[PDB]
Swiss-Prot record, chain A:
Interacts with VTA1; the interaction occurs at he endosomal membrane. This is Vacuolar protein-sorting-associated protein 60. It is found in: Endosome membrane; Vacuole membrane. Present with 2110 molecules/cell in log phase SD medium.
Swiss-Prot record, chain B:
Belongs to the VTA1 family. Residues 37-68 are annotated as: Interaction with VSP60. Residues 1-167 are annotated as: Interaction with DID2. The lineage of its organism: Eukaryota, Fungi, Dikarya, Ascomycota, Saccharomycotina. Present with 4400 molecules/cell in log phase SD medium. GO terms for biological process: late endosome to vacuole transport; late endosome to vacuole transport via multivesicular body sorting pathway; lipid transport; protein transport. It is found in: Cytoplasm; Endosome membrane. This is Vacuolar protein sorting-associated protein VTA1. Has a role in the formation of the multivesicular body (MVB). Required for the sorting of lipids to form intralumenal vesicles and for fluid-phase transport to the vacuole. Required for sorting the plasma membrane proteins STE2 and STE3 into the MVB. Acts a cofactor of VSP4, promotes the oligomerization of VPS4 and stimulates its ATPase activity by 6- to 8-fold. The chain holds residues 1 to 167 of 330 of the full protein. GO terms for cellular component: endosome; ESCRT IV complex; multivesicular body. It comes from the Eukaryota. One of its GO terms (molecular function) is protein-macromolecule adaptor activity. Homodimer (in cytoplasm). Interacts with VPS4; the interaction requires the dimeric structure of VTA1; 6 homodimers of VTA1 appear to associate with the dodecameric VSP4 complex; the interaction is ADP-dependent. Interacts with SNF7; the interaction requires DID2. Interacts with DID2. Interacts with VPS60; the interaction occurs at he endosomal membrane. The keyword Membrane applies.
């Protein structure tokens, strides 16, 4: 009942996923063919692991 | 690996400060199984998992309805569905994670990029891993791949943001 209203508004949890549909529209404008293969995922992945340590706390 | 469990535990505390114990409640459960699913455990990690069990039972007891229902068995009972019904909670947890994740990609469209966004992206990645671990049986392997792609997208863009490529 007020389960949806209590956590958020009258909107249904599934409606929140509709907002996710907009996400597709956002990436679609950037490039419908925008695929990880087009982005240097391999080089970026290695660099991020080093950067992750910068923002994370190592023991 | 083990550090991820600490982030999840600390991240769960953040939701409590915001009053979203329901979100932190699932995060604590994800880290608990995470430690058990870890082959390497230390007296500190083993004891840390035990303390989390007390919180889960204390949190669930807070809304279990064993006595709280007497005070209010109508609205609290439905809220219990969020904790007791893992399938229904899965959708809300996914909607919450997707809502935060959707905002990050929306900002990528034209929103301002900064170090603060860098830390927020790392937080979203943890939420996706928890959703898959909390309900691997309720998520098909193909459906899981779609979620992993969203996490990977942040991993690639997060690197570009730190490289000053986006902005």
């Amino acid at each position: 009942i007020n389960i949806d209203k209590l956590q958020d508004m009258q909107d249904e949890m599934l409606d929140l996923i509709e907002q996710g549909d907009e996400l597709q529209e956002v990436l679609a404008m950037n490039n419908n063919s925008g695929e990880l293969d087009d982005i240097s995922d391999a080089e970026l992945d290695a660099e991020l692991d080093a950067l992750a340590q910068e923002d994370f706390t190592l023991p | 690996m083990a550090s991820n469990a600490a982030r999840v535990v600390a991240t769960a505390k953040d939701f409590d400060k915001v009053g979203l114990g329901i979100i932190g409640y699932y995060l604590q459960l994800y880290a608990v199984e995470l430690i058990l699913s870890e082959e390497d455990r230390s007296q500190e990690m083993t004891a840390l998992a035990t303390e989390l069990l007390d919180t889960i039972e204390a949190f669930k007891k807070e809304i279990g309805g064993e006595s709280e229902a007497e005070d209010s068995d109508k609205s609290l009972h439905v809220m219990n569905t969020l904790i007791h019904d893992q399938e229904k909670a899965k959708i809300y947890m996914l909607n919450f994670t997707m809502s935060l994740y959707n905002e990050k990609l929306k900002q990528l469209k034209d929103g301002p990029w900064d170090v603060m966004l860098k830390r927020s992206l790392w937080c979203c990645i943890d939420l996706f891993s928890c959703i898959l671990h909390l309900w691997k049986e309720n998520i098909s392997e193909t459906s899981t791949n779609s979620l992993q792609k969203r996490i990977k997208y942040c991993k690639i863009y997060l690197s570009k943001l730190a490289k000053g490529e986006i902005g």
